[PDB]
Design a protein around this ligand. Sequence first.
Ligand SMILES: *[C@@H]1O[C@H](CO)[C@@H](O[C@@H]2O[C@H](CO)[C@@H](O)[C@H](O)[C@H]2NC(C)=O)[C@H](O)[C@H]1NC(C)=O
Ligand SMILES: *[C@@H]1O[C@H](CO)[C@@H](O[C@@H]2O[C@H](CO)[C@@H](O)[C@H](O)[C@H]2NC(C)=O)[C@H](O)[C@H]1NC(C)=O
Ligand SMILES: *[C@@H]1O[C@H](CO)[C@@H](O[C@@H]2O[C@H](CO)[C@@H](O)[C@H](O)[C@H]2NC(C)=O)[C@H](O)[C@H]1NC(C)=O
Ligand SMILES: *[C@@H]1O[C@H](CO)[C@@H](O[C@@H]2O[C@H](CO)[C@@H](O)[C@H](O)[C@H]2NC(C)=O)[C@H](O)[C@H]1NC(C)=O
Ligand SMILES: *[C@@H]1O[C@H](CO)[C@@H](O[C@@H]2O[C@H](CO)[C@@H](O)[C@H](O)[C@H]2NC(C)=O)[C@H](O)[C@H]1NC(C)=O
Ligand SMILES: *[C@@H]1O[C@H](CO)[C@@H](O)[C@H](O)[C@H]1NC(C)=O
Ligand SMILES: *[C@@H]1O[C@H](CO)[C@@H](O)[C@H](O)[C@H]1NC(C)=O
Ligand SMILES: *[C@@H]1O[C@H](CO)[C@@H](O)[C@H](O)[C@H]1NC(C)=O
Ligand SMILES: *[C@@H]1O[C@H](CO)[C@@H](O)[C@H](O)[C@H]1NC(C)=O
Ligand SMILES: *[C@@H]1O[C@H](CO)[C@@H](O)[C@H](O)[C@H]1NC(C)=O
Lengths: 117, 415, 98, 49, 49
Amino acid sequence: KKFLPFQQFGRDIADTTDAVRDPQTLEILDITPCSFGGVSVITPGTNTSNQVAVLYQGVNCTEVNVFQTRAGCLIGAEHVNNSYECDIPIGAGICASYQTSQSIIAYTMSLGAENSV
Amino acid sequence: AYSNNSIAIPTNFTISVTTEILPVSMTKTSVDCTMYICGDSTECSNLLLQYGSFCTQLNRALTGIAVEQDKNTQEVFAQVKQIYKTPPIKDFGGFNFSQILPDPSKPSKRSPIEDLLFNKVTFNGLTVLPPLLTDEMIAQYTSALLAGTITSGWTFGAGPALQIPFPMQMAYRFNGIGVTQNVLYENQKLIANQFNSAIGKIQDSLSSTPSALGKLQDVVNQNAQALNTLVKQLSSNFGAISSVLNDILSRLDPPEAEVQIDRLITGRLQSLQTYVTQQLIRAAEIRASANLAATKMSECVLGQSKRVDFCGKGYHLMSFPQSAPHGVVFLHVTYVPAQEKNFTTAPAICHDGKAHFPREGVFVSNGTHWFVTQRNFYEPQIITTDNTFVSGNCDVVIGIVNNTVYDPLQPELDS
Amino acid sequence: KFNGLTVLPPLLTDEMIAQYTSALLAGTITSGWTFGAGPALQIPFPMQMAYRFNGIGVTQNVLYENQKLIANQFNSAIGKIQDSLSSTPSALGKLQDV
Amino acid sequence: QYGSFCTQLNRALTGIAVEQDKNTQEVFAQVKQIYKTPPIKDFGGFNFS
Amino acid sequence: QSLQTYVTQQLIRAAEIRASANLAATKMSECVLGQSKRVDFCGKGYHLM
Ligand SMILES: *[C@@H]1O[C@H](CO)[C@@H](O[C@@H]2O[C@H](CO)[C@@H](O)[C@H](O)[C@H]2NC(C)=O)[C@H](O)[C@H]1NC(C)=O
Ligand SMILES: *[C@@H]1O[C@H](CO)[C@@H](O[C@@H]2O[C@H](CO)[C@@H](O)[C@H](O)[C@H]2NC(C)=O)[C@H](O)[C@H]1NC(C)=O
Ligand SMILES: *[C@@H]1O[C@H](CO)[C@@H](O[C@@H]2O[C@H](CO)[C@@H](O)[C@H](O)[C@H]2NC(C)=O)[C@H](O)[C@H]1NC(C)=O
Ligand SMILES: *[C@@H]1O[C@H](CO)[C@@H](O[C@@H]2O[C@H](CO)[C@@H](O)[C@H](O)[C@H]2NC(C)=O)[C@H](O)[C@H]1NC(C)=O
Ligand SMILES: *[C@@H]1O[C@H](CO)[C@@H](O[C@@H]2O[C@H](CO)[C@@H](O)[C@H](O)[C@H]2NC(C)=O)[C@H](O)[C@H]1NC(C)=O
Ligand SMILES: *[C@@H]1O[C@H](CO)[C@@H](O)[C@H](O)[C@H]1NC(C)=O
Ligand SMILES: *[C@@H]1O[C@H](CO)[C@@H](O)[C@H](O)[C@H]1NC(C)=O
Ligand SMILES: *[C@@H]1O[C@H](CO)[C@@H](O)[C@H](O)[C@H]1NC(C)=O
Ligand SMILES: *[C@@H]1O[C@H](CO)[C@@H](O)[C@H](O)[C@H]1NC(C)=O
Ligand SMILES: *[C@@H]1O[C@H](CO)[C@@H](O)[C@H](O)[C@H]1NC(C)=O
């Protein structure tokens, strides 16, 4: 972005600043909040096992067995090619389950057994 | 033109395909209340902690709303336990389904109408969560429902998918609306051509008019307006010296910075409660729409509804689903009687002093002769003892007319 | 009243809603259910009732042999409606409550 | 100093007011043509007066 | 606060009235414009009109 000579700051639609001008050097650098999201714990029944996976929602696998899905970064979950009925919905077509030795896994959920008439 | 002895009976009909758009799901917006109210400010966070559960229960309500959105989508579209597929040969008796069937050439497995539908709809602690089912999965579900309807009629809904030739399925649909199934086979090419033309007009009808997808676009616009208003509320002072929390923290020592932060906290918490209440009400409306859509997919698509105007204007024949961003579109194929003629009628016919009533249909007269026709389509037949039944006499029925009833056994006996 | 609270008139007046109900009534009386599916097709009202009778699983001759009794009972039931409504005030509560 | 609260309340009330007319329209305007009964009231003895 | 309370109650009541109006429109479509076979949808007994 190009600032007019008297313009110094940049106000976002909520009074937060997206862009700015430094006193020491006049070069203008835009500002973005570091990162934020929602930590979710994918677990089976504690009666069954105590292994867990942690999904950092809506973020990459850099800011945080680190499969990177569209829901966010999945840590601790094994990626399995096989599809199954959705047991724990994660999002964006990804569901998790606890299956056999036993561990939690993440897969693209199956919409049902295919058929043809 | 009402009179006590006149009826109008259709002589010709048309296939009508109408479009019904129903919203199914909202955008899964999640709001971090602490970040919205106290952006990385321990002083504010400690002050907000004094309000107890006001903050967490808003997040709980929004999480419930998002789960309900996924549940709505699943209820509407995941009505079939198997993914059915159409045969590579489209020998459907002249009926052309290529405009609603998935297109393999396209990167996505969407029908042309589905792509037309999709092309016509458009950092403050706020995040959006992706839906559990992607657009391609909704397209797969709609394709499975479409293949089931095309190749098995209503059988794939009740039990296992039983194949049936599509013209025979249309004959079933004919008998469902009270029109004899020979009308289909005698007019199969005309019916197929009218159906194909009606399907072809749907693209133009949706594409030309830019407000055709108004329901889904209004849902999106309402959600965007709510989010924008929630964001804009952060610039309000609410009586404090500055709407910027960092400015108050930098300018004031805690003893009065806490008063200013308390004013800001009150204002922003009220804004969050307002937003969550409006979201809950709108989610209730969307859930009602999704329940209606699921009922329509069960009764209009998986079956043949007899409910008037439930599956569009006219006598329902079938419906086809199409995915759409945040919703579903039903193409309702119905019968509309087109050309009619004005005949004279009689409630019964006096043959030998006995009154004859039609087993199915109505007695009509073309000026001089009397016939019996099916109610919804003009098809005159000779009045015989195999078309009529006997009950009572001619001294009881009001308006009975003298005529002759043919007995097919008499010339067989004579010959 | 004078505190910023106003009431807006509905788009359809009482006369227009009455006209709509009149049109629906005339269509039902003179054409049965045909006015709803597509073109309105006239049919004698006495002939329309056996079709309705056929829908419930009762044969047409039941209505034709008993046409006078059925008409008299229908007229008596309509008179009773008016009587009941005016006689008991609670009846129209669902609206009044609103 | 309270921002859009006034505007949001006005918008919600306007939406309700529009929805009321929509409700009346969907309930009563289900017929395209205005049908009228003939001056002949011979409906086989059925009195619709 | 009084206005917000009033508007919230009006929104909930408007949702209820919308549900009632949808039911009324369905009943007019299926019982005035047709002969419904749904039990108790349009009166006790076997629906005629
Ligand atoms: C179904 O209709 C489509 C058009 O809507 C037909 O596709 C056309 O086929 C002709 C050849 O007969 C081509 O010249 C056109 O370019 C095609 N148009 C499009 C848009 O693809 C299709 O052939 C029809 N299918 C059947 C079985 O009749
Ligand atoms: C019923 O109406 C259809 C039109 O909806 C008639 O089919 C048309 O017939 C004309 C001849 O008069 C042709 O020029 C058109 O091409 C036909 N249209 C189609 C789509 O095939 C049909 O003939 C009518 N049938 C009767 C018995 O009147
Ligand atoms: C009503 O239909 C009858 C039966 O078809 C018509 O009578 C026929 O008239 C045609 C053409 O004039 C002749 O081919 C037949 O020989 C006649 N049949 C009999 C049994 O007479 C009659 O013309 C029609 N009435 C009117 C006024 O159209
Ligand atoms: C239908 O035919 C019957 C006879 O088959 C007609 O009834 C006759 O009416 C005439 C004049 O009233 C009498 O002379 C006969 O004795 C009657 N016969 C019987 C068996 O009742 C009747 O009029 C005819 N209906 C019409 C309206 O033409
Ligand atoms: C339909 O019923 C109404 C009454 O419900 C009849 O109107 C009455 O007619 C008598 C004359 O026989 C008058 O004495 C009454 O004052 C009328 N009452 C009202 C309320 O108008 C009407 O005649 C009937 N119509 C038919 C065709 O039978
Ligand atoms: C020192 O003076 C001003 C103060 O901001 C600054 O614009 C200027 O660039 C500085 N000198 C440099 C960077 O050479
Ligand atoms: C962030 O995720 C994207 C995939 O959406 C990936 O391409 C990118 O490499 C990730 N981050 C960085 C900076 O690499
Ligand atoms: C799943 O299939 C794809 C094909 O490239 C790939 O990820 C891999 O072969 C499979 N996953 C493994 C190796 O676990
Ligand atoms: C039958 O006759 C009536 C008498 O007015 C007329 O209004 C009606 O249009 C006629 N029907 C046809 C199909 O010509
Ligand atoms: C129909 O009404 C006319 C009077 O316009 C009457 O002459 C005729 O007998 C009636 N016919 C029937 C069948 O009711």
